[PDB]
Design a protein around this ligand. Structure first.
Ligand code: DBV
Ligand code: DBV
Ligand code: PEB
Ligand code: PEB
Ligand code: PEB
Ligand code: PEB
Ligand code: PEB
Ligand code: PEB
Ligand code: CL
Ligand code: MG
Ligand code: MG
Lengths: 67, 177, 76, 174
């Protein structure tokens, strides 16, 4: 069911081939290739939108509308 | 089902889940079109703020009464809730595209959603336009026919994945319209 | 001098010709034509970005994707 | 006068419509085109700032490493904020047809502040140059998101003018 929590799956796709910052978060088995430099992260996050963002969208909308 | 993400999708906990290395190698052969699929998800979620704001502000420029004193986006509170819902929807669509399966979108986002909107008076015609604009954004990011210079990915044809993501947006539209 | 207050001009351009929401905010009377349905507003307001909003932007930026416009210049 | 009071003395916003707007357009060059040009930047400001900061970082990811100047939400917020401040002052220079407020209220003293803080000038210059490219395309209506119904004509003069305001920013902070 839609549970009213305002949570959703936040996905971060980290394709960091060639990156000097070493992987560490994933601790499962290694592939022995470029998959060891790439990762899919997912996390349940409460989705929040700020007052400031809402004010910015309001100002954009007023400026772009005509009639 | 993506078992690594089972707790994520049930909101069982707030712990991050990670799929790299051999688990990622296997994931890309479990789902189809694996590399292109992950590039497609990346191009949508990395642009989420702009997709949602452009969709909501387009919904509004087409129907300005939404931010009149009687409209359902009037006040920062209502605008923020609308932008938040656009993002929740976009993110569940992004998970359908990651997994190649609409189940979590249908079951954890869409089931019961229309009846909530009806009780609140969230206008369905306006909501459908926000969703339609988000869909157009996602299709353009996935099936991006600019030259190699302008793409973050090796050039090729991602029209199939763009059609697939379009179908997930169409499931949202059918559920709430 | 730059006064460190984080205040900056904030412009809203309202080309609202034909808009059914009546104008009520001008103070200098009427042009007798379409300028009477348009307005430039200028305020001086503090610019602020919350830490939570910056966290949302980082989660987008860290993946090295882009919009439609522009060349792709990342090496990552 | 009304805008000057606001941007420097009078706390409340200036609302310039009707006859006052007719008068405003007699004192700025190419008034109608100029207001279209300003709106094309201001109404798209969120994407301009985001794209510029994102591009600065994707060209130099060390900015979000633990030793980088955008590390932590606090610092990233301050950088996003500063991009928006700069864009706002450039947009007001285009509205007013003048660089005086930009120079006095945004640029004078800015480099000294960034030097003391350690805000990296090369990175900052890149954020500004991406914003410049965005603004030129929006003025000429050649960005990927276009305004549909602007009357066709040549705004290359206004695009050159806004480019010069960005160049003042670059010169002041580089
Ligand atoms: C290369 C790009 C980078 C340069 C150059 C640099 O200075 N920083 C670079 C990258 C960078 N990565 C992080 C943070 C995270 N990266 C991952 C993904 C990797 N971890 C893994 O285990 C694998 C594969 C098996 C990866 C690929 C994750 C999960 C994080 C943590 C943050 C998150 O959003 O979850 C940063 C941020 C600062 C830091 O933690 O170093 C940067 C800038
Ligand atoms: C037409 C577009 C609209 C429809 C249809 C609708 O339902 N609302 C529409 C417009 C709309 N306008 C505002 C708010 C303001 N508009 C102005 C500018 C006008 N006022 C003037 O005096 C003149 C010219 C002489 C104008 C042009 C201003 C200053 C405001 C107030 C808000 C602000 O940003 O300062 C709204 C917002 C809700 C409301 O106030 O009615 C809407 C949706
Ligand atoms: C009000 C006058 C009004 C709008 C506001 C605007 C809304 C709108 N937007 C599109 C389509 C797209 N928007 C996109 C968004 C983005 N592209 C980027 O590069 C950034 C990161 C991001 C945020 C701005 C994209 C990719 C698209 C799709 C391509 C395209 O240009 O069409 C539409 C069209 C929707 C449709 O096709 O049904 C609309 C209506 N338009 C307004 O009129
Ligand atoms: C990181 C992987 C990365 C980026 C992020 C990206 C940065 C980049 N962007 C430009 C140029 C433009 N960006 C524009 C922005 C927008 N256009 C829209 O329609 C929306 C609303 C808004 C936000 C996305 C625009 C208009 C331009 C100019 C386009 C043109 O000229 O027609 C550049 C180029 C900067 C330069 O020319 O110096 C770059 C690098 N690229 C990345 O790789
Ligand atoms: C539509 C989506 C795009 C497009 C995509 C292409 N991507 C191609 C190859 C490719 N992409 C990745 C990155 C991907 N794999 C991962 O595991 C992760 C993250 C965890 C990501 C983001 C890889 C590794 C590869 C393969 C190696 C490479 O070529 O770099 C690709 C070419 C191969 C193919 O055709 O299957 C394409 C076409 N291309 C486009 O033009 C649109 C915009
Ligand atoms: C470069 C910026 C553009 C471009 C601009 C043109 N705009 C022209 C005319 C025009 N624009 C407006 C709207 C403007 N005036 C205001 O007072 C306000 C808001 C307060 C705005 C947003 C008006 C009223 C007009 C006059 C015509 C009309 O009645 O609509 C225009 C025509 C020439 C001119 O008037 O000088 C041009 C060229 N055109 C382009 O193709 C680029 C991309
Ligand atoms: C934006 C395109 C809309 C619009 C949206 C509004 N939604 C409001 C309330 C609301 N939305 C949901 C659904 C949301 N919560 C979830 O947990 C999930 C999925 C898992 C979703 C998609 C709920 C449950 C509620 C009520 C509770 C709440 O807001 O947290 C809403 C009213 C907000 C308020 O008055 O506080 C708005 C304005 N409004 C529009 O005009 C367009 C069409
Ligand atoms: C983003 C593209 C940058 C970046 C920027 C940072 N700026 C930081 C602080 C800061 N900025 C200003 C100037 C600002 N305040 C004003 O009043 C005006 C104009 C009227 C402007 C343009 C000041 C005075 C300050 C210091 C006080 C404050 O934070 O408000 C900042 C924080 C540094 C720190 O706390 O360590 C950052 C990160 N950083 C980058 O890496 C890119 C290049
Ligand atoms: Cl676009
Ligand atoms: Mg089912
Ligand atoms: Mg990449």
């Amino acid at each position: 069911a839609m549970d009213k929590s305002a949570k959703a799956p936040v996905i971060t796709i980290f394709d960091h081939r060639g990156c000097s910052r070493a992987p560490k978060e994933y601790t499962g088995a290694k592939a022995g290739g470029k998959d060891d430099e790439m990762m899919v992260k997912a996390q349940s996050v409460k989705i929040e939108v700020s007052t400031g963002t809402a004010e910015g969208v309001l100002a954009t909308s007023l400026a772009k509308m005509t009639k | 089902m993506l078992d690594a993400f089972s707790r994520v999708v049930t909101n069982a906990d707030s712990k991050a889940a990670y799929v790299g290395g051999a688990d990622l190698q296997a994931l890309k052969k479990f789902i189809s079109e694996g590399n292109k699929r992950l590039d497609s998800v990346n191009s949508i979620v990395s642009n989420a703020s702009c997709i949602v704001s452009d969709a909501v502000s387009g919904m509004i420029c087409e129907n300005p009464s939404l931010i009149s004193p009687s409209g359902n986006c009037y006040t920062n509170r209502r605008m923020a809730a609308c932008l938040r819902d656009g993002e929740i929807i976009l993110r569940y669509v992004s998970y359908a595209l990651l997994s190649g399966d609409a189940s979590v979108l249908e079951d954890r986002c869409l089931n019961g959603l229309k009846e909530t909107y009806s009780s609140l008076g969230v206008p369905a015609n306006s909501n459908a336009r926000a969703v339609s604009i988000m869909k157009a954004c996602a299709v353009a990011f996935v099936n991006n026919t600019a030259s190699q210079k302008k793409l973050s990915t090796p050039q090729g044809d991602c029209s199939g994945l763009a059609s697939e993501v379009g179908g997930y947006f169409d499931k949202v539209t059918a559920a709430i319209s | 001098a730059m006064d460190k207050s984080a205040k900056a001009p904030q412009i809203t351009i309202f080309d609202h010709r034909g808009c059914s929401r009546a104008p009520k905010e001008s103070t200098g009377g009427k042009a007798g034509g379409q300028d009477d349905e348009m307005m430039v507003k200028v305020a001086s307001t503090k610019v602020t970005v919350s830490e939570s909003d910056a966290a949302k932007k980082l989660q987008e930026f860290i993946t090295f994707e882009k919009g439609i416009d522009g060349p792709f210049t990342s090496k990552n």
